[PDB]
Every structure is written in C-alpha cells, then in structure tokens.
Amino acid sequence: EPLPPPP
Amino acid sequence: HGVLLEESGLDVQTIPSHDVLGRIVIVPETDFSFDEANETIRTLARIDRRILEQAANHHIYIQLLTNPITDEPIARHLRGKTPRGYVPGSKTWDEVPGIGGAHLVLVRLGHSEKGKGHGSINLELHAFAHSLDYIVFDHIHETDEFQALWREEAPQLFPREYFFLTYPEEYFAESFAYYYVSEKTQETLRMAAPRTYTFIRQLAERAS
Ligand SMILES: [Zn+2]
C-alpha cells in the first residue's frame, strides 16, 4: 500500500 | 535502473550490518552525493539486525533516488494524486520525497530531515517502517495490542496532530523513527509513550 510520510 | 549497494563502488564495511544492507539498499546509477547516501545508510544501520534480516527475507528493497519518486515505474500511477491522509489541494505524490508500505521503498536523497518536503524526523526510517509493518510483521498496526497503544499514547507524542491521531499505521512508522533516529528521540518516545517504546523494542524479538 502506498504510504506517505507525515505532511 | 539503480545498483545494489553491494554491487556499487561505495565503501561500507565500517557500516554496521553492511552485509544485509548491501542486499537491501539500491543507490542511483547516476552521480549522486556520497555524504547523503552514507548518512541515509548509516541511519538504516541503526535498525536491529534481526529486523533487517527479516526485510531481506521478505525481499524488501530501499532505493535511494536523485529525482521525484513518481518518476519511477512503481509509483508512476500516483502522479497528480493527493497522498493518503493529506488535505486535498495541499500536495501531490510528485512532491512527496519518500514512500513505503510495499516491497520497494523509495527515498529521495537530501530530504531526510524534517521539513524537506515532509514532516517526519527521519524520512528513510519512516518510509521503511511502513514496509516492515505491512510485509514483515503482517500489518501489526492492526493488532488489538497496537490499537490500544495508539489510542492511549498517540496524543502524548503527537498532540493535536490529526495525521498521527487518525492513522495508526502512521503512528507506527513515526514511532519507529523516534526509536532509531538517536538516543535523544528514543528517550523522548520512552518518556511520552512508554508502552509504544516497549512495542517497537519488542519488534527485534518478533523478527527472530
Ligand atoms: Zn507515513
């Protein structure tokens, strides 16, 4: 699943 | 395309666990910065070797890039789209310097520290923790144990930060980074969220 870093 | 660290010219024998990281890390085929690559790899080398070895067993790779992550075939489909958990209109994946959760982690060199296109204390540890969570530990953020730690202690370490208070998988990845970035941040995690500290610490024992 594509998981981003915190904004 | 990329080159495996063990197949590159970079010297890494003084880096802890360089034999396993040599099979995990992929560095660019084109001129990059040796300092930025060395600092990123040595940070990953702080991870307990049992965890790194489990990542290699599950065929997880960490590719370091000198370009946006969406230039790579694996993430091309994310071009123009808002990342999960972000407010619409505030960001696209093309602007995100790191991504984890699958078998290929992407980390753009020079964007490790907080504010460099992201809000994590360490981009490579956060992104890699996503793949460990989903692949090595079979979505361990979903366990009843971790759900309890997240509800109780996420407000203690990230107060009024909707991102960590809404997505337990994001609380896992950033707590992992706090544990491994430095003696200071690990102590911060231990002080504000002692159960979460203990959980991350026990991962090395789960990986063996
Ligand atoms: Zn994340």
Side-chain angles (χ1 to χ4, degrees), chain A, chain B residues 2-208:
Chain A
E1 185 143 79
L3 288 179
Chain B
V3 308
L4 275 173
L5 174 60
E6 62 189 6
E7 297 179 12
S8 73
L10 198 65
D11 179 301
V12 303
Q13 286 285 330
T14 44
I15 296 175
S17 302
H18 64 266
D19 290 318
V20 63
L21 292 170
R23 76 179 301 166
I24 293 171
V25 178
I26 302 167
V27 302
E29 269 193 32
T30 53
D31 64 321
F32 59 100
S33 159
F34 299 110
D35 269 336
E36 283 162 6
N38 181 77
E39 274 290 290
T40 297
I41 296 165
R42 291 188 179 268
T43 295
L44 294 169
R46 301 180 58 87
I47 299 171
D48 188 290
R49 184 175 296 176
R50 295 166 282 184
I51 298 174
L52 297 177
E53 186 174 338
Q54 272 304 152
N57 290 343
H58 285 79
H59 305 101
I60 297 170
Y61 299 84
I62 305 172
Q63 184 172 10
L64 315 181
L65 302 172
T66 59
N67 51 258
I69 67 178
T70 48
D71 289 0
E72 304 303 319
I74 198 176
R76 278 213 70 83
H77 67 291
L78 302 176
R79 292 187 53 257
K81 300 227 269 284
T82 302
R84 193 274 288 111
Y86 285 50
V87 175
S90 70
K91 193 87 164 188
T92 60
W93 275 106
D94 314 74
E95 301 167 320
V96 172
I99 182 185
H103 293 263
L104 179 56
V105 180
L106 305 179
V107 177
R108 189 173 181 179
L109 295 169
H111 299 68
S112 174
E113 295 79 13
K114 182 183 268 179
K116 302 188 176 181
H118 67 90
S120 171
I121 59 174
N122 185 272
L123 179 64
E124 61 264 21
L125 287 170
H126 182 96
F128 187 40
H130 281 307
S131 294
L132 299 174
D133 176 16
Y134 277 52
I135 302 180
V136 169
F137 301 111
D138 193 46
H139 302 87
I140 199 172
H141 77 268
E142 292 181 352
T143 64
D144 297 314
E145 179 171 20
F146 187 84
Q147 293 275 318
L149 308 175
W150 162 64
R151 295 191 302 269
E152 184 200 356
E153 295 186 342
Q156 293 303 318
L157 184 57
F158 308 107
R160 292 291 287 173
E161 302 190 28
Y162 83 90
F163 195 75
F164 299 110
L165 302 177
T166 301
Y167 303 101
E169 62 263 39
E170 289 294 345
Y171 180 63
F172 176 94
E174 192 64 4
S175 294
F176 188 93
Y178 267 79
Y179 186 91
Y180 280 115
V181 155
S182 69
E183 174 183 12
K184 182 212 218 147
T185 61
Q186 178 177 315
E187 200 59 28
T188 302
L189 179 69
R190 193 171 156 248
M191 291 296 178
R195 286 174 147 97
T196 303
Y197 163 87
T198 297
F199 189 86
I200 299 296
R201 176 187 172 86
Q202 292 177 332
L203 292 174
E205 293 69 26
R206 290 172 187 264
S208 63

